[PDB]
Structure 1
């Protein structure tokens, strides 16, 4: 009965407080999602000045409730089943041969808006590595995100490896370990194993002078025909 909150266009609000190797920063984001098409549009502004890490590294952190679950897979959509109350999304993101991000987020409805409020901590980054050295290109690849139930936590476990292209033609992996648990006590759907196929386009606003990211995503669940 959470799926019905997502049949139309839903306003999104995103706020993040972060710290990577002692570099403090905040980001605010806003846009809208239309989960019927698995589509979302968001714009992010670093409100504390220059972002200390590359924008691409925060795409996964900045609302999987907006994925398109096709009609035959609707019994497997944990994300929307947890709403309006929401879910807590936690991750550890291991940058290959560099630091890690640990994030904790609350994804829930605040009135009619879907809010994603995040805290992020980055530790052990090389000062001249690809992340703090700003060596990633401003683009993004398409991935598969593997979901499985975690029946003991009443939530789900999620694993995927992001590929960030590097300015020299190599690739920086970011291994994502994730867990989602309901905030409410209402019943949730615990899905069968499946995956999400993702696509992301990064761009800029020609008239925006603050450091910023314009993001459009398409995400569609697949994997189950039983």
Structure 2
């Protein structure tokens, strides 16, 4: 049988992203729009800094900017926490530790508002070096592919996730961003608590040649795997 949560994602869904941020007192806001196609695990989003120049590098916000759009193949349909929490939604909390620099703490509420899937985020960053790789804008505008490891936290009626991003610094080096996350349902209804598995990510960053505001165009694909004889 197809669950309610699953059914909400059977076609293309419009997405709205909202972020209010404050990094070392540098305040900024971002809005994003686009759409998600969970059948293909496909996100197409464009973000605008509505407060002027973004005070951190766009790539450092990629992971923050809707895991309900991951492609869960049929055989893994019992392990899709994210869709099972819909439409009421879930809250994602992360801490992102930038090695030898500051940290971001984020809280994102992911829920439907009518037909639109909303990702509403508050981001707080502290302890950054004002001339470091983040506040000094020394990161390249590119992105690596990654696997992301998901485990149940049954005790907390949710999931925990940990992974590493390795941002490319303009000198050929690496700025590690260690991610730790918890996702919890907003509502009181049952959710699917998964066996251990992972999500496989690829991300491409680009620019709109007709856009004069500070912005990022993101194309991202996300597929679940790690659970698998018929052959």
Structure 1, unpaired ranges of 5+: none
- Deviations, residues 132-191 of structure 1 (Å, cap 9, x unaligned): 000000000001110000011100000010111110001111000000000011100000
Mapped partners of 2:91, 2:28: distance in 1:
22
Mapped partners of 2:43, 2:61: distance in 1:
16
Structure 2, unpaired ranges of 5+: none
CA RMSD, Structure 1 to Structure 2 (Å): 1.0
Displacement, 1:41? Answer: 0.2
User: Secondary structure of 1:3's partner?
Assistant: helix
Give the TM-score, by structure 1 length: 0.99
Give the TM-score, by structure 2 length: 0.97
Does residue 1:204 correspond to 2:207, yes or no?
yes
Does residue 1:47 correspond to 2:50, yes or no?
yes
Displacement, 1:53? Answer: 0.1
Aligned to 2:20: 17
Mapped partners of 1:162, 1:80: distance in 2:
25
Displacement, 1:66? Answer: 0.5
Counterpart selection for 1:216 from 209, 214, 219:
219
Mapped partners of 1:50, 1:117: distance in 2:
20
User: Secondary structure of 1:57's partner?
Assistant: helix
- Deviations, residues 85-128 of structure 1 (Å, cap 9, x unaligned): 00000000000100000000100000000000000000000011
